[PDB]
């Protein structure tokens with residue numbers, strides 16, 4: 001038994017730097033839902049692990065011209081990591097290069113606006129141009145719009161790919177920031193789980209409108225032919241049945257009525 005390298009990513013409340021991370025070392029520098037999930041999964045698969053923040057800070061997308069993966073998916077495909085424990089969305093194209101456990105949490109694409117903005121749904125965004133909108137750069141949200149042929153989404157993608165300045169953001173925070181300072185002239189498309197978290201914390205200036213654009217899940221990913229495959233799925237399954245994943249979700253998303 002060799003130390004397992006866990007690639008993950010900074011995204012609240014999945015993985016956050018502890019308040020005193022400066023005086024801490026290793027896996028102790030972090031906290032969050034996925035930090036807790038990793039300890040559980042590790043304990044049930046009987047392995048010691050090392051939490052490693054993805055080098056390029058991305059989830060993963062296959063380059064159009066080079067067909068080479070970046071982000072966490074790439075860490076996995078190119079042997080730089082043994083397993084990904086993060087809010088990584090299970091999608092068809094990712095399933096062709098890596099393997100996923102059964103999902104551990106659900107979500108769907110959603111819309112974030114600054115309170116006051118006149119937008120209630122994706123359709124509203126598609127038939128107007130005053131209010132700009134975009135998504136996280138190399139993630140599944142972006143790939144949902146790029147690949148969609150549904151009229152409204154297709155129309156949203158056509159505008160997004162050519163807007164100026166670029167409507168895509170390097171990180172979630174960046175996107176959330178853009179909404180807050182853009183006086184309502186920028187709406188952000190991100191996953192519901194993350195939308196709900198922001199929406200209920202200070203400054204309470206944003207909100208989620210409309211229903212989710214689709215439905216999917218987050219899964220623990222491993223390289224093709226990994227030896228952890230069965231063990232993590234059994235682990236994720238057990239955790240599901242015991243109701244641990246829900247309790248865990250309820251803890252990290254616990255709302256202080258802040259808003």
Ligand SMILES: N[C@@H](CCC(=O)O)C(=O)O
Pocket residue numbers: 059060087088089136138139140141142189190191
């Ligand atoms: N969960 C997404 C990243 C977030 C997003 O694209 O909105 C992924 O695995 O790519």
Ligand SMILES: [Zn+2]
Pocket residue numbers: 017021
């Ligand atoms: Zn710090």
Ligand SMILES: [Zn+2]
Pocket residue numbers: 040043044
């Ligand atoms: Zn346990």
